[PDB]
Amino acid sequence: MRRTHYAGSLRETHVGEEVVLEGWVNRRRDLGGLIFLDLRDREGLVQLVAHPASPAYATAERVRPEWVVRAKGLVRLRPEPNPRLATGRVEVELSALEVLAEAKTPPFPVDAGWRGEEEKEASEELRLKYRYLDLRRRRMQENLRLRHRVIKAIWDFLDREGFVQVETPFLTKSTPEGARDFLVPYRHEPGLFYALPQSPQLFKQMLMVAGLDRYFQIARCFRDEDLRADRQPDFTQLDLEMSFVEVEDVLELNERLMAHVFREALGVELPLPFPRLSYEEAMERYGSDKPDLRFGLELKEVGPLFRQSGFRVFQEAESVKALALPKALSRKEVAELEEVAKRHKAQGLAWARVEEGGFSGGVAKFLEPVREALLQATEARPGDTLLFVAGPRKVAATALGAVRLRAADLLGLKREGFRFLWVVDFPLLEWDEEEEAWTYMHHPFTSPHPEDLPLLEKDPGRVRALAYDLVLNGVEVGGGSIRIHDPRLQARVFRLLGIGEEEQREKFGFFLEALEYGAPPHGGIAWGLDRLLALMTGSPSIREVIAFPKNKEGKDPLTGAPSPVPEEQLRELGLMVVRP
């Protein structure tokens, strides 16, 4: 039994050796009297050859794709090297072959990728229903193995930096991360529930109050919220906290860590330190707090330039933001971008061609009377086309910010590599419109900027937080902040967030008490690990870097969960379904 090597590990150096391989029949080809079988295992393919003389022939004759076999043979040099395979120079002449398991015909192929050939995408629902076969594809294995490598690299780095890995509870008390809690009924007292954690937040802070100076965990978080390609109800974060630190210490720690991860997993060198943008200029220059820096097209305020201009939209509007495309837009594209701008609360979109001494279409007429001031502000050249969106403040920036992303796609602009950036100076709060009150921008335990303290009642929304987001290619891959460690301030900010003394006691009593026993200053961050890996593998969604993810409905096609349970069982938990 015991194999001597991994099928896909055989190289020229192995010629002459008798080997025992174990794997799956990737493909069978009857070519002449000979039978060639491509044996695969996780390290790749290797060609097996059965001659009619050999006792292995009868078996090689009966074999089908995905059948599991034990193969014994002599490694020989291929008279015809196959450049597309790592084992390409060699092949195994078979002396024996045993079938260990047969396999029904798979609902989709898994063989192409192992030959370097392109794979037709199968329906996701189908891939999910037979995830165990989907995970046989090379791309899927590369993804999981990269996930492994990334986490080991994180452990190696934080361990060396002195971090203590601590596992926090899953059957706990509710954590406010902005989402709904998944509940777990407590059998001995119907009506009582545990909440799965939205994050380890309160526990990692308590670990700081406990004197473990620095902590980390590959934490699983649960949030019963609306799901999309960057959202699973059950996800992973690289959670981390440090004591006696200031914003700089955290960000500096994270960059060295991230660069260690990219060097180790991708062999890519990240230039340090990462660029930084205040929440204002990121919102100014890109209409978003997770800027995609794989391309320019920066937003520019040109509202002053149109304070007395022929058309009313750029005249009446608070701000008019404009950017410059390096290529022209078709009129179906222009129509699209226009649709984009209106999905973001803006009236519409405007544009004009930048000629070699003038302007051409759209609103070019109104640009001529300001040509040298407008072309100065935009830096627009001849052959570009300017895009404009007017209206309020936020809306002009967000709308022309979204159209900036769409345009980069349509104009298929070079978007390669990784571009990280810290978005800092976020505002402490955020206005909840569906409930006429303030809520947290990140979470309630986020510390206000040491100064904006007075303004904490004068003007709630002008308060700066010691928060920060880590973004990669326009995706928020991490978020954290320095925490409030003074118990007074925490209850103050708690009141501001609308919670009364009594709710504070039911929801965070234990934690406010913890702050009174000598909490040191602390802060941290949490990366969305699934997101970071999706990006590191150029995957279209995080589902591609999770072994067994859920579909958009939060369901598991593979197992059938969530599924019904016998009445006796629910009854035993003192629960019953109020169904229609």
Ligand X SMILES: Nc1ncnc2c1ncn2[C@@H]1O[C@H](COP(=O)(O)OC(=O)[C@@H](N)CC(=O)O)[C@@H](O)[C@H]1O
Ligand Y SMILES: Nc1ncnc2c1ncn2[C@@H]1O[C@H](COP(=O)(O)O)[C@@H](O)[C@H]1O
Q: Which residues are annotated binding-site positions?
A: 177, 223-225, 232, 442, 476, 483, 528-531
376: which DSSP letter? Answer: H
**Rounded distance, CA 356 to CA 340, Å?**
29
Rg for the chain, CA atoms, rounded: 30
Residue 349 interacting with ligand Y (CB under 6 A): yes
Residue 347 interacting with ligand Y (CB under 6 A): yes
Return the number of the residue (6 or 418) whose C-beta is nearest a copy of itself: 6
Task: Extract the tokens encoding 438.
Answer: 């303030």
Task: Extract the tokens encoding 512.
Answer: 């406010």
For residue 129, the minimal CB distance to ligand X (Å) is 22
Return the number of the residue (387 or 533) whose C-beta is nearest a copy of itself: 533
Partner whose binding site includes residue 348, from a copy of itself, ligand X, ligand Y, none (CB under 5 to 8 Å by kind): ligand Y
**Burial class of 413 by CB neighbour count within 10 A (0 to 12, 13 to 18, 19+):** middle
For residue 275, the minimal CB distance to ligand Y (Å) is 29
User: Among 575, 539, 533, which residue's Cα sits nearest to residue 148?
Assistant: 533
C-beta of residue 234 within 8 angstroms of C-beta of residue 211: no
Residue 288 interacting with ligand X (CB under 6 A): no
Residue 336 interacting with ligand X (CB under 6 A): no
Q: Which of 47, 199, 217, 398 binds ligand X (CB under 6 A)?
A: 199
Return the number of the residue (322 or 514) whose C-beta is nearest ligand Y: 322
For residue 575, the minimal CB distance to ligand X (Å) is 23
Partner whose binding site includes residue 40, from a copy of itself, ligand X, ligand Y, none (CB under 5 to 8 Å by kind): a copy of itself
**Burial class of 356 by CB neighbour count within 10 A (0 to 12, 13 to 18, 19+):** exposed
Part in contact with ligand X (CB under 6 A); list of ranges 105-113, 130-138, 232-240, 401-409: 232-240
For residue 280, the minimal CB distance to a copy of itself (Å) is 27
For residue 120, the minimal CB distance to ligand X (Å) is 28
User: Among 336, 497, 514, 490, which residue's Cα sits nearest to residue 431?
Assistant: 497
Return the number of the residue (303 or 528) whose C-beta is nearest ligand X: 528
For residue 368, the minimal CB distance to a copy of itself (Å) is 56
User: DSSP secondary structure string, 310-354?
Assistant: SSTHHHH-SEEEEEEESS---TTHHHHHHHHHHHTT-S--EEEEE
Partner whose binding site includes residue 201, from a copy of itself, ligand Y, ligand X, none (CB under 5 to 8 Å by kind): ligand X
**Rounded distance, CA 379 to CA 297, Å?**
10
Q: Under DSSP, is residue 271 helix (H, G, I), strand (E, B) or coil?
A: coil
**Rounded distance, CA 38 to CA 57, Å?**
14
Task: Extract the tokens encoding 234.
Answer: 């059950």
User: DSSP secondary structure string, 9-72?
Assistant: G--GGGTT-EEEEEEEEEEEEEETTEEEEEEEETTEEEEEEE-SSSTTHHHHHH--TT-EEEEE
The pair phi, psi for residue 41, each rounded to 5°, is -150, 180
Residue 177 interacting with ligand X (CB under 6 A): yes
User: Among 490, 297, 289, which residue's Cα sits nearest to residue 389?
Assistant: 297
For residue 234, the minimal CB distance to ligand X (Å) is 8
Distance of CA 320 to the CA centre of its chain: 32
User: Among 219, 232, 221, 135, which residue's Cα sits nearest to residue 549?
Assistant: 232
Return the number of the residue (120 or 188) whose C-beta is nearest a copy of itself: 188
- The number of residues that bind ligand Y (CB under 6 A) is 12
**Rounded distance, CA 569 to CA 10, Å?**
54
Amino acid at 267: G
Residue 402 interacting with ligand Y (CB under 6 A): no
For residue 522, the minimal CB distance to ligand X (Å) is 10
Part in contact with ligand Y (CB under 6 A); list of ranges 13-21, 292-300, 384-392, 474-482: 384-392
- Which 424-453 positions form the footprint of ligand X (CB under 6 A)? 442-443
Q: Which of 67, 114, 235, 274 binds ligand X (CB under 6 A)?
A: 235
Question: Among positive and negative, which fits the CA dihedral 308, 314, 317, 318?
Answer: negative
For residue 337, the minimal CB distance to ligand Y (Å) is 10
Part in contact with ligand Y (CB under 6 A); list of ranges 344-352, 404-412, 467-475, 533-541: 344-352
Please state whether beta strands 44-50 and 90-101 pair in parallel, antiparallel, or not at all (unpaired): parallel
The pair phi, psi for residue 164, each rounded to 5°, is -100, 125
Annotated binding-site positions for ATP: 223-225, 232, 476, 528-531
**Rounded distance, CA 560 to CA 558, Å?**
6
Task: Extract the tokens encoding 9.
Answer: 């590990």
- Which 480-539 positions form the footprint of ligand X (CB under 6 A)? 480-481, 524-526, 528, 530-531
Part in contact with ligand Y (CB under 6 A); list of ranges 65-73, 387-395, 450-458, 517-525: 387-395
Residue 161 interacting with ligand X (CB under 6 A): no
Return the number of the residue (386 or 389) whose C-beta is nearest ligand Y: 389
Residue 467 interacting with ligand Y (CB under 6 A): no
Q: Which of 116, 348, 487, 521 binds ligand Y (CB under 6 A)?
A: 348
Residue 350 interacting with ligand Y (CB under 6 A): yes
For residue 226, the minimal CB distance to ligand X (Å) is 9
For residue 276, the minimal CB distance to ligand X (Å) is 17
Distance of CA 319 to the CA centre of its chain: 33
Partner whose binding site includes residue 576, from ligand Y, ligand X, a copy of itself, none (CB under 5 to 8 Å by kind): a copy of itself
Return the number of the residue (316 or 457) whose C-beta is nearest ligand Y: 316
**Burial class of 454 by CB neighbour count within 10 A (0 to 12, 13 to 18, 19+):** exposed
User: Among 272, 393, 260, 395, which residue's Cα sits nearest to residue 340?
Assistant: 395
**Rounded distance, CA 219 to CA 156, Å?**
17
Partner whose binding site includes residue 546, from ligand X, ligand Y, a copy of itself, none (CB under 5 to 8 Å by kind): a copy of itself
Partner whose binding site includes residue 303, from a copy of itself, ligand Y, ligand X, none (CB under 5 to 8 Å by kind): none
In the complex, the residues that contact ligand X under the rule CB under 6 A are: 177, 199, 201, 223, 231-232, 235, 237, 442-443, 476-481, 524-526, 528, 530-531
| Residues at the contact surface with ligand Y, assessed by CB under 6 A | 313, 317, 338, 346-350, 388-391
